[PDB]
Design an enzyme around this catalytic site. Structure first.
Site, PDB file in Angstrom:
ATOM      1  N   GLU A   1      -7.263  -6.064   3.607  1.00  0.00           N
ATOM      2  CA  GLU A   1      -6.072  -5.257   3.243  1.00  0.00           C
ATOM      3  C   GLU A   1      -5.284  -5.093   4.512  1.00  0.00           C
ATOM      4  OE1 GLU A   1      -7.335  -2.004   0.657  1.00  0.00           O
ATOM      5  OE2 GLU A   1      -7.310  -3.042  -1.055  1.00  0.00           O
TER       6      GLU A   1
ATOM      7  N   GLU B   1      -8.805  -7.841  -5.776  1.00  0.00           N
ATOM      8  CA  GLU B   1      -9.163  -6.673  -6.274  1.00  0.00           C
ATOM      9  C   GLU B   1      -8.213  -6.218  -7.410  1.00  0.00           C
ATOM     10  OE1 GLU B   1     -10.066  -3.580  -3.462  1.00  0.00           O
ATOM     11  OE2 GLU B   1     -10.952  -5.246  -2.041  1.00  0.00           O
TER      12      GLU B   1
END
Length: 386
Positions: free
Chosen positions: A155, A293
């Site tokens: 991320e 996710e």
């Protein structure tokens, strides 16, 4: 088999969350943020539930010595975990995760406490470390077939208090890192020349990705590359912020609202719109997308439990239906927290690892229903059997 070819067989996905990415220095890190040592039986239960791919968040810099070499016993353990999946025909997305922020934060700020712009020396230094780690990984896994995918980062610059408002500035740097990962893996040749690799968008954020990381900026043409974003809207339902107490969301979807704690944004039309952006930017251009996710919290609440359970089902259903329709593979975030399911605060856990069984039945039913309703779009240049 190339990216289109494997993508159509990859959905739905599941994450081995809070496991191999934990920032401990030893093999015991595997059971430090969740309790259960991974086994073949656990992975068999993930397949039996209906998942076709497993994302494995994994830390590597934290398991490296002062010369940068990854601990051989750590590497052997990660390989064993991957092999549980490969033994079952499960596709694996093996990444380098937050990993104590070595690149996720410090590739983009010179400080972990405040935003301090990096310079060329930092960027080139991080490129070299990233290529070192990925050379080691890729060489170790060189003989695995297309069932094994690598994801270079997790991320990048997601940390809001540092990086909010800097996505335009930072995306070109991330493009360099993504390119570095690809170059290092492709150089090792063998199956690694042909493996599908997954590169991450800015803050794994849809809006920033489709803006700043257009397809012409990706490190390879379409063929053997995927793009990754994460999806946690609305955070009060999904668990990212303001997700317990009076501000929390228990109910989601037009048809599922109740007395209070109703989602006020981020419902089905919003989700469809966002996923559509990914189709437009990437999947229509021959780059499958992974939503690496996503989650909703399954809770025990004092109000209308059935409506909450229906909301959780419906959310998993929409994610997986709308993903499939848009050429996106979605991966459920699951940290093996069975106790949270019995509280207001909730948990996104679907698989009870200790018992190799599904405990998140509402989420799982939703996944299954969503996959069933979806119609995967085929982007082909030649006839396939079908």
């Amino acid at each position: 088999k190339d990216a289109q070819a494997i993508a159509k067989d990859m959905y739905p996905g599941w994450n081995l969350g809070n496991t191999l990415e934990a920032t401990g220095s030893g093999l015991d890190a595997e059971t430090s943020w969740q309790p259960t040592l991974t086994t073949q039986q656990i992975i068999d239960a993930v397949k039996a539930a209906g998942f076709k791919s497993v994302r494995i968040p994994c830390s590597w810099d934290i398991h490296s010595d002062s010369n940068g070499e990854i601990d051989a016993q750590w590497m052997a353990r990660v390989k064993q975990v991957v092999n549980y999946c490969i033994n079952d025909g499960i596709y694996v997305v093996l990444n380098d995760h937050w990993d104590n922020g070595w690149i996720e934060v410090l590739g983009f700020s010179k400080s972990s406490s405040s935003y301090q712009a990096v310079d060329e020396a930092t960027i080139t230094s991080k490129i070299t470390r990233l290529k070192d780690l990925w050379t080691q990984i890729a060489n170790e896994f060189k003989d695995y077939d297309e069932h094994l995918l690598f994801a270079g980062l997790n991320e990048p610059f997601q940390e809001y208090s540092l990086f909010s408002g800097h996505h335009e500035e930072l995306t070109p740097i991330l493009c360099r890192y993504n390119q570095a990962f690809v170059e290092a893996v492709r150089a090792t040749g063998g199956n690694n020349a042909q493996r599908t690799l997954v590169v991450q968008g800015p803050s794994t954020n849809i809006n920033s990705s489709v803006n700043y990381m257009t397809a012409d900026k990706l490190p390879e043409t379409a063929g053997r590359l995927m793009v990754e974003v994460h999806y946690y809207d609305p955070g009060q339902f999904c668990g990212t912020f303001d997700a317990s107490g009076d501000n929390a969301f228990y109910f989601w979807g037009a048809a599922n609202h109740s007395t209070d704690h109703n989602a006020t944004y981020g419902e089905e039309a919003y989700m469809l719109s966002q996923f559509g952006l990914l189709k437009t930017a990437y999947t229509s251009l021959g780059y499958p997308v992974i939503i690496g996710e996503y989650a909703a919290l399954q809770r025990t609440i004092s109000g209308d439990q059935n409506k909450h359970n229906a909301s959780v089902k419906y959310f998993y259903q929409c994610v997986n239906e709308y993903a499939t329709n848009n050429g996106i593979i979605a991966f459920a975030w699951d940290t093996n927290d069975t106790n949270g399911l019995n509280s207001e605060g909730g948990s996104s856990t679907i698989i009870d690892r200790a018992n190799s069984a599904v405990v998140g039945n509402n989420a799982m039913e939703g996944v299954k229903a969503g996959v069933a309703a979806g119609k995967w779009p085929f982007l082909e240049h030649h006839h396939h059997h079908h």
